[PDB]
Every structure is written in structure tokens, then in C-alpha cells.
């Protein structure tokens, strides 16, 4: 039981207006040079590989 | 643009070169101009060089002199337009760069820590004199 303290139960809008700045930016992405896959900028897709740096997975 | 530091050097027309070489760990004297009240003197000031702060043009060196029972130090800039003559007197082995201990421990105990770097002596003694014959012919 201590120091500063809320005085009045923060209302609903009160609680909610703070939370506008909290919604998530959806992930940005590009399509793979070769794959028909969707993939981040400046990345290596979790299926393909590249053309100067492997990734090549398996069956 | 890509000359950012050449600019300062270009500003360095105030550059001399008749300065002889040396390095921390040896004694030397300068000769300096002081507004001697009514006039100006050549204040010969002989001592040990202690620190050397290099930065191209504004490179400074600090000389220490024990005068009349008082440990003094004196800081001069290399390209100072006040150095008439300046001639070394002796050279010595370094082992370290700066030497802020001759401050505390100033005595005969420095007459054994200095020691005569006789290597550069021959070097100094070489071009000083044997190259005089490479002038008189």
C-alpha cells in the first residue's frame, strides 16, 4: 500500500483514448525474385535461397 | 569539400622548417622574444623537453627548467614566430613518451634515468660535421 495514487477510477473513454497509439502497423513485405512467395525487404525467403548466398532447404 | 583538412594546411603559410629535430627525453634551449618592458630580449631558456603535443601546425612542446631552486615548466608552440635560434645540447633515451615524474622526482635520480642516448649522438655528430665537407668543395 504506497506512494502517489490514482484518485478516481479512470473512465472508459479515458482508458481507451490513451490506447489509440497502440494499434499494430501490419508487416511490410515484398515478393521473392524467383519464388511466388511473400517476404520481407532485404531478406532471404524460408523456402528459396538466392543467387550469391544459399539457403536451400529440403523435402 | 573532400579537402576539409587540407584547408587548414592551406591556411598554414605561417610554417617554418629551420627547426632541428628532437624528441621527448633530452635537453635543449630556445631563444625567445619578450616585451621586456621598454624593448625586447632574446631570452635564452634551457631545459628538458617533457611533453610533445603534435597536431601538424599547432604542435606544442613543454620545456621544464629548474631555476634558482624552483621547479618550472614552460610550454611553447613549435611554429611560434618568436623562436630566433634554437639549438639542442644533449639527447637521451626515452623508454616512455611523456614523463610527468620528473616533476615529483627531480634530482640526481634523473641524471641516471635520462642516460646518454649515444646512438643519435653519432647521428647528430655525423651530418653536423662530416657533411660540412659536402659544402666547402
Amino acid at each position: 500500500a504506497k506512494h502517489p495514487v490514482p484518485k478516481k477510477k479512470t473512465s472508459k473513454a479515458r482508458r481507451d483514448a490513451r490506447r489509440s497509439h497502440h494499434a499494430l502497423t501490419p508487416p511490410t513485405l515484398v515478393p521473392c525474385p524467383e519464388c511466388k512467395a511473400m517476404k520481407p525487404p532485404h531478406t532471404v525467403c524460408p523456402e528459396c535461397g538466392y543467387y550469391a548466398g544459399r539457403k536451400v532447404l529440403e523435402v | 569539400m573532400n579537402r576539409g583538412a587540407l584547408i587548414k594546411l592551406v591556411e598554414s603559410r605561417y610554417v617554418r622548417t629551420d627547426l632541428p629535430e628532437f624528441r621527448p627525453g633530452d635537453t635543449v634551449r630556445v631563444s625567445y622574444k619578450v616585451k621586456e618592458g621598454n624593448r625586447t630580449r632574446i631570452q635564452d631558456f634551457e631545459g628538458i623537453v617533457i611533453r610533445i603535443r603534435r597536431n601538424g601546425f599547432n604542435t606544442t612542446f613543454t620545456v621544464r627548467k629548474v631555476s634558482y631552486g624552483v621547479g618550472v615548466e614552460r610550454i611553447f608552440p613549435l611554429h611560434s614566430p618568436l623562436i630566433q635560434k634554437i639549438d639542442i645540447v644533449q639527447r637521451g633515451r626515452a623508454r616512455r613518451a611523456k614523463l610527468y615524474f620528473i616533476r615529483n622526482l627531480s634530482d640526481r635520480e634523473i641524471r641516471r634515468k635520462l642516460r646518454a642516448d649515444r646512438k643519435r649522438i653519432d647521428k647528430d655528430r655525423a651530418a653536423e660535421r662530416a657533411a660540412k665537407e659536402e659544402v666547402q668543395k
Partner: protein, 122 residues
């Protein structure tokens, strides 16, 4: 740089040998005192039967400093101590001799009589 409660040495035959500053004589609310400046000191140590004995309230001029001295000719100069010469309202020093190097700085301040009897000026 010399502040109150700072044992200076004594550079003249005035008698004393170690004094502590009280206040700087360079202005109202002023901080330090490099060379060439006058201070009020209290002789805290002095040769027996001198002209200024212990526990006195003197006026002395500072001629040394363990701080550096950015002389306006670029050059700099420093000593291994702090030393003053005891003077008076008449400014002229009260001893009959001064020893130790004294900075050029003083000569400009009209303290001619000291750089006159200087053993070496720097």
C-alpha cells in the same frame, strides 16, 4: 588559481614562509587569482622575529601558480608551487630581497620594483 584557504609560499626576505589566502583583491564576488594579483592572507608560518610574525593580516602579491599561464603570445608557463611577496597599501614590497622566478605578468602591472630585483623573469 588561488582561492581562500590556500597555503602560498613566501618568496621574499620579509620573514614569513607560508601564508593562506583570505580573499582575492580583484573585485566583489570574484573566484580565483592567478599571478599578478593581490590577495589578503594571514601569515600562518613565519621565521622568528621577522617583520611579519605569525597570525598577522597581510597584503601580498602572487608571483607564482601551479596553474598554467596562457600568455597571450600562445606560450604558456607554470611552476611547481604557489608563492607570494608580502606588500602593503603602498604596494612596494616590504622585504629587501625576492627569490624565485617571477612571471613577466607582474612587470606589466606596475610592480616594477620586484621584477627589478627579480633573479630571473619568465
Amino acid at each position: 588559481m588561488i582561492q581562500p584557504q590556500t597555503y602560498l609560499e613566501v618568496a621574499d626576505n620579509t620573514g614569513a614562509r607560508k601564508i593562506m589566502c583570505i580573499r582575492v583583491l580583484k573585485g566583489s564576488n570574484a573566484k580565483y587569482a592567478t599571478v599578478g594579483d593581490v590577495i589578503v592572507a594571514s601569515v600562518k608560518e613565519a621565521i622568528p622575529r621577522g617583520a611579519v610574525k605569525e597570525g598577522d593580516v597581510v597584503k601580498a602579491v602572487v608571483v607564482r601558480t601551479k596553474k598554467e599561464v596562457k600568455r597571450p603570445d600562445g606560450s604558456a608557463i607554470r611552476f611547481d608551487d604557489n608563492a607570494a611577496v608580502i606588500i602593503n597599501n603602498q604596494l612596494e614590497p616590504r622585504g629587501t630581497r625576492v627569490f624565485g622566478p617571477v612571471a613577466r605578468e607582474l612587470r606589466e602591472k606596475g610592480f616594477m620594483k620586484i621584477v627589478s630585483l627579480a633573479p630571473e623573469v619568465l
